[PDB]
Write a protein that binds this ligand. Structure first.
Ligand SMILES: *[C@@H]1O[C@H](CO)[C@@H](O[C@@H]2O[C@H](CO)[C@@H](O)[C@H](O)[C@H]2NC(C)=O)[C@H](O)[C@H]1NC(C)=O
Lengths: 46, 270, 221, 40
């Protein structure tokens, strides 16, 4: 029951260790892709 | 020429030279456009004629209308843990906690500014030329380095004459890299069979802005050696030379060359 | 006439050697040789709560506020990046087409540039504006614009480039128009012409011009 | 521990050196992906 709290917190910073590493790297490119959307929204301009 | 005959009111007719290209004093005999004007079989020669001392003794050249020179084109290359704890914050008691938080605030400003400034760095990236100029070490010492270099030009031209009279060994080296046309040099350079091509400055500028892509460039931001001009060959001691050149000066003052050069000499690449 | 042509035609001078602007009026009255300079015209211009806000029902609000803080700092990073990144051009400036008392562009009184601009009546308003602020010498205009009393200065390219090398605040514009040259003024048809032009050409052909540029033109300050 | 560091007494010295290396590497990757996606 406590896995959800720990997993989601690590998004923003044997079997169990491997699964989180993929999820964390998935979150790594997720926030990296989010900063791109910040750049994309920056170009936008009554 | 259409602008010329309009104000002086002279009639004319054209024809194409069959012997020679631009003029070569072979056995004391000139050919091409210059050779005929010496023989007076024609009274005026118009085209791409390079003003130099040697050619100014057999004919007369009017004031140049475009500036050029000699250039070279190349293809564009593509307590122990106290330091430990404080060290991790920059890489992303009660008073002890206060010092950590304010240090993190400094670190965030440090890292945030670091990435934003680093982003602007790649925006203004640039490139440089591999050769300083005509007096380059690879030029004055061609094929004298670990990587043998290659470069040549079209024979029987004014540019070839200039090289032989200022750098004998450099002229001798280019004998095995002689081209025969503008396109052949461009393609051979594209295929890598040639490393550098030396030719007239005015036309190689035209090809650079009109090549497929911008793969071929000239040395530097445009560098000219031995500035001169393009001229109109006239029969010796003509009575028109006073009136021929006076029209050209009228062109620059009014400004017709700007429109004409944009019509013919404009380019695509920057 | 006056100036250099006024003295040369009076006989007190024999051969004008200076940065002589080749135009159509001069060619009718006096003779030239091959120009020794290549340039145009341009403009000179001057330039636990403490650990959370910074990083059981209350814990849900705490994690929600942590997410809020993260999105707030991301937004602040975005706006500071936008703040630090995002925020005349020759004769084609409309503000110079119809100038005012603010944009001050001036030129040298009784110089070839004023006659050149008077030739094209399409710049009559410019001819009607420069007439109020013509300066005697280029030094006066440079000093006045250094005091920021001027805003523009139509002048040659090489002189203003050497000036920008001397003074880092001096800046030029983009347009490069009226590509003329400087040559050697002469008397009328004289044997001091053919060999003079041949010598000028022989000086241009070899590296003599590059050496003279090393002496004065090429050097930067 | 090492598998938990590269992604998150010369032993920990080299560990923190490699942590700095990882931080600069990921910063470089972020910079290059952002330049590759935004501008061109
Ligand atoms: C430069 O001129 C020479 C002489 O005209 C050219 O050499 C001639 O080339 C043609 C075609 O191969 C031969 O038929 C002649 O017999 C050659 N004559 C001599 C004396 O060499 C030479 O080809 C010209 N430059 C070029 C384009 O290479």
């Amino acid at each position: 029951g406590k896995a959800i709290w720990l997993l989601w917190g690590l998004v923003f910073n044997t079997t169990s260790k491997i699964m989180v590493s993929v999820w964390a790297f998935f979150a790594v490119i997720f926030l990296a892709s989010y900063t791109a959307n910040l750049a994309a929204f920056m170009i936008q301009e009554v | 020429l259409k602008k010329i005959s309009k104000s002086v009111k002279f009639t004319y007719d054209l024809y194409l030279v069959t012997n020679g290209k631009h003029g070569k004093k072979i056995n004391g005999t000139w050919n091409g456009m210059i050779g005929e004007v010496v023989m007076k079989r024609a009274y005026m020669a118009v085209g791409s004629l390079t003003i130099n001392e040697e050619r100014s003794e057999v004919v007369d050249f009017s004031v140049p209308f475009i500036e050029t020179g000699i250039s070279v084109m190349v293809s564009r290359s593509n307590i122990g843990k106290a330091i430990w704890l404080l060290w991790g914050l920059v890489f992303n008691g009660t008073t002890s906690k206060i010092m950590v938080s304010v240090w993190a605030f400094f670190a965030v400003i440090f890292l945030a500014s670091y990435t934003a400034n680093l982003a602007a760095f790649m925006i203004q990236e640039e490139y440089v030329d591999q050769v300083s100029g005509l007096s380059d070490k690879k030029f004055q010492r061609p094929n004298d380095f670990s990587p043998p270099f290659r470069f040549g030009t079209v024979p029987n031209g004014s540019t070839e004459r200039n090289i032989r009279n200022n750098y004998a060994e450099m002229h001798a080296y280019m004998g095995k890299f002689n081209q025969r046309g503008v396109d052949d040099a461009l393609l051979s350079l594209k295929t890598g069979k040639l490393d550098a091509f030396i030719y007239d400055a005015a036309v190689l500028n035209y090809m650079a802005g009109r090549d497929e892509g911008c793969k071929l460039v000239t040395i530097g931001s445009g560098k000219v050696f031995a500035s001169t001009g393009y001229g109109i060959a006239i029969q010796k001691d003509s009575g028109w030379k006073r009136q021929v050149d006076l029209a050209i000066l009228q062109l620059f003052g009014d400004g017709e060359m700007e429109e004409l050069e944009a019509l013919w000499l404009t380019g695509i690449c920057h | 006439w006056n100036g250099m042509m006024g003295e040369l035609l009076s006989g007190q001078a024999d051969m004008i050697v200076a940065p002589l602007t080749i135009n159509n009026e001069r060619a009718q009255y006096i003779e030239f040789s091959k120009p020794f300079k290549y340039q145009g015209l341009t403009i000179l211009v001057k330039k636990f709560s403490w650990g959370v806000l910074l990083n059981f029902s209350a814990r849900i609000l705490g994690m929600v506020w942590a997410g809020f803080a993260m999105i707030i700092v991301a937004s602040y990073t975005a706006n500071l990046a936008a703040f630090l990144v995002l925020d005349i051009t020759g004769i084609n400036d409309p503000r110079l087409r119809n100038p005012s008392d603010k944009f001050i562009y001036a030129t040298v009184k009784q110089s070839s540039v004023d006659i050149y601009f008077r030739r094209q009546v399409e710049l009559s308003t410019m001819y009607r504006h420069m007439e109020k602020h013509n300066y005697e010498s280029a030094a006066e205009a440079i000093q006045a614009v250094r005091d920021n009393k001027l805003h523009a200065f139509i002048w040659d390219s090489a002189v203003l480039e050497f000036e920008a090398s001397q003074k880092c605040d001096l800046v030029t514009t983009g347009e490069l128009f009226f590509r003329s040259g400087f040559g050697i003024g002469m008397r009328k048809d004289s044997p001091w012409k053919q060999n003079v032009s041949l010598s000028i050409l022989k000086s241009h052909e070899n590296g003599f011009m590059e050496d003279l540029d090393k002496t004065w033109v090429r050097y930067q300050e």
